């Protein structure tokens, strides 16, 4: 795992994208590179001890949909350091940074069944009061909850599932 190596590159890419008003394009560009990083043949090439320069050129070629500023520079700098396998994380970090500056939170909700869209809108407005961000709910239908909902807002979690209450009662006994 290489969160720690991806942090500098993500921060540099984002801090550059706001100097040139193209965060939205950079995100899709990094997502394209992160997908090319996963291929079975390309992952065999990245493991191979080619010279950083020719390995970078062998990586530029498979992605022409890329700015001069973005691909031909970021990919080369990451190749000189041998960091290209970090791209899937440089993406996620980038997204996160964006969500930070845009004052947004990707709250996740989990339930045994669909919510009434009044429950869910109340959840949105209430989390937006609990936090200080525009929330973006996404639901999951997990049956083991059976009733109630889990609201996860990053490291904070609120558990109202009947299974959670049952197992807590199990440990009050």
């Amino acid at each position: 795992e290489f969160i720690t190596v991806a942090r500098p590159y993500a921060k540099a890419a984002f801090d550059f994208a706001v100097e040139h008003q193209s965060v939205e394009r950079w995100q899709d560009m990094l997502a394209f590179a992160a997908e090319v990083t996963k291929n079975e043949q390309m992952a065999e090439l990245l493991s191979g001890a080619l010279a950083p320069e020719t390995l970078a050129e062998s990586f530029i070629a498979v992605a022409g949909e890329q700015l001069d500023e973005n691909g031909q520079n970021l990919i080369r700098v990451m190749a000189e350091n041998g960091r290209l396998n970090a791209l899937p994380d440089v993406l996620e970090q980038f997204i996160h940074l964006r969500a930070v500056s845009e004052a947004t939170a990707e709250v996740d909700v989990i339930s045994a069944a669909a919510l009434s869209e009044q429950q869910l809108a109340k959840i949105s407005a209430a989390m937006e009061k609990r936090l200080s961000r525009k929330v973006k709910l996404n639901a999951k239908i997990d049956k083991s909850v059976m009733a109630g909902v889990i609201i996860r807002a990053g490291d904070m979690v609120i558990d109202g599932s009947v299974r959670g209450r049952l197992e807590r009662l199990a440990d009050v006994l």
Partner: protein, 512 residues
């Protein structure tokens, strides 16, 4: 137990009092598990020294707050943990229960009772890693702690707020001397604490049976981290014991604490340190192993009346609080100059050096004069003991060197022949049986008998029977004097004459 309605009403009360609502909590995932250390991902608001709650009603202590993970040590069996389990951050820096209510109960490092007798009744919690009283908040040590051993109480007086190192090779009566000090504390204001670090469970079972048998258990807290428990529990135990003792210290009472094998705490801290990749030092012990023992032992202190008055917010006025520590250190072949021994000797205010070749020769307790000292000294000692005992230590050391010379010199001067007899009798007199603590009056009159020559005819032999008969005679007739001596400890020419009259009457009229 036929009243199963008791079981149904217990369960009904548990169901009724169950709180149905839920609250927000901060949560992380276990990413790695090895050798007792876990790495946690998440817990942005974890704080260094916090208690993290694992699935299974046990805790880990967050020691490393790295940039993207929390390195914590599990307090208990780790092996069932796995990557992907989720942990919750408690808002608490490492706590332990404290108070009178756990006085007389057996608990582990986290204050959970391993005694079986139900839950504790503490009052509040105390932070384990606390800070000692400052330079201006302390007071001089000038009150006695009696260990009940003639050798220590005469030669090496211990004061309330002193730190005396019990140091010696393996199997020389260190644990015995410590638990006999605890048992003596029964019927004194001093509350006792025994912290066993790395001890095998059979030793702890024996210790608790002997504490309850001699009735000392109702006075004392027993803190257990057995040889098989995780090193985190062994490393962090003495600090829990120190907090439980400091509760009493801060209220203007007296406590005494024994740390059994601080050398095993240093080994457990070395293990936990190396497992976190921290750089090593002189013998692989981490760099701050001194600051491990120091910041523990400096909490043992006597605090002045203004400190306890301000701490307790005016509820106690005249009292001075104290906590007395007796750390135990195990040396190898008596090399005092080892690393951890010479650190702890540089920390404490004295040492009771126990010599193995005296112990095997039946000299029990095997305290070695000369090399053992109390730097607080006679200020702690009671006046009668200070008067009687002044010579005994130097007399014994010079007797030992003279008796070393003697083996090569038969047919020797008749002047040294008497010093070398009187030393051999005093060295024979100062040993005593395993669980027999002796009060200040009993020790005082035995030492008066030894110092004022009343032995020299009985100097033959059977001096043990003489000592037992003398105690039983004085207990039969002159108990009002034993009472005066035990209550006041004072010494007068009138008391000197009384003691002369006692030994004159004993020697003429009784047998042994």
């Amino acid at each position: 137990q036929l009243n199963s309605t008791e079981i149904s009403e217990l369960i009904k009360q548990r169901i009724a009092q169950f709180n149905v609502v839920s609250e927000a909590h901060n949560e992380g995932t276990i990413v790695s598990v090895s050798d007792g250390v876990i790495r946690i991902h998440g817990l942005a608001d974890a704080m260094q020294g916090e208690m993290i709650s694992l699935p299974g009603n046990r805790y880990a202590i967050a020691l490393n707050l790295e940039r993207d993970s929390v390195g914590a040590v599990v307090m208990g069996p780790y092996a069932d943990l796995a990557e992907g389990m989720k942990v919750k951050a408690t808002g608490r820096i490492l706590e332990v229960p404290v108070g009178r209510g756990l006085l007389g109960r057996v608990v582990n490092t986290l204050g959970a009772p391993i005694d079986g007798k139900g839950p504790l009744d503490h009052d509040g919690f105390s932070a384990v890693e606390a800070i000692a009283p400052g330079v201006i908040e302390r007071q001089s040590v000038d009150q006695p702690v009696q260990t009940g051993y003639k050798a220590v109480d005469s030669m090496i007086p211990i004061g309330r707020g002193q730190r005396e190192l019990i140091i010696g090779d393996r199997q020389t009566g260190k644990t015995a001397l410590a638990i006999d000090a605890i048992i003596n504390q029964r019927d004194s204001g001093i509350k006792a604490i025994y912290v066993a670090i790395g001890q095998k469970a059979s030793t702890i079972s024996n210790v608790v049976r002997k504490l309850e048998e001699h009735g000392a258990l109702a006075n004392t807290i027993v803190v257990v981290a057995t040889a098989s428990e995780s090193a985190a529990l062994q490393y962090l135990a003495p600090y829990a014991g120190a907090a439980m003792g400091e509760y009493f210290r801060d209220r203007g009472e007296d406590a005494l604490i024994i740390y059994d094998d601080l050398s095993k705490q240093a080994v457990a801290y070395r293990q936990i340190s190396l497992l976190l990749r921290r750089p090593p030092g002189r013998e692989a012990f981490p760099g701050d192993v001194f600051y491990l023992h120091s910041r523990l032992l400096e909490r043992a202190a006597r605090v002045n009346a203004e400190y306890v008055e301000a701490f307790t917010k005016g509820e106690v006025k005249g009292k001075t609080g104290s906590l007395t520590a007796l750390p135990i250190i195990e040396t190898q072949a008596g090399d005092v100059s080892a690393f951890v021994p010479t650190n702890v000797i540089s920390i404490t205010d004295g040492q009771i050096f126990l010599e193995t070749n005296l112990f095997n020769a039946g000299i029990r307790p095997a305290v070695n004069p000369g090399i053992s000292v109390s730097r607080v000294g006679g200020a702690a000692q009671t006046k009668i003991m200070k008067k009687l005992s002044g010579g005994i230590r130097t007399a014994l050391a010079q007797y030992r060197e003279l008796a070393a010379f003697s083996q090569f010199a038969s047919d020797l001067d008749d002047a040294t022949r008497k010093q070398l007899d009187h030393g051999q009798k005093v060295t024979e007199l100062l040993k005593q049986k395993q669980y027999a603590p002796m009060s200040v009056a009993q020790q005082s009159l035995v030492l008066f008998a030894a110092e004022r020559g009343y032995l020299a005819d009985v100097e033959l032999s059977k001096i043990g029977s003489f000592e037992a008969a003398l105690l039983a005679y004085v207990d039969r007739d002159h108990a009002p004097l034993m009472q005066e001596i035990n209550q006041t400890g004072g010494y007068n020419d009138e008391i000197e004459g009384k003691l002369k009259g006692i030994l004159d009457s004993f020697k003429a009229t009784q047998s042994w």
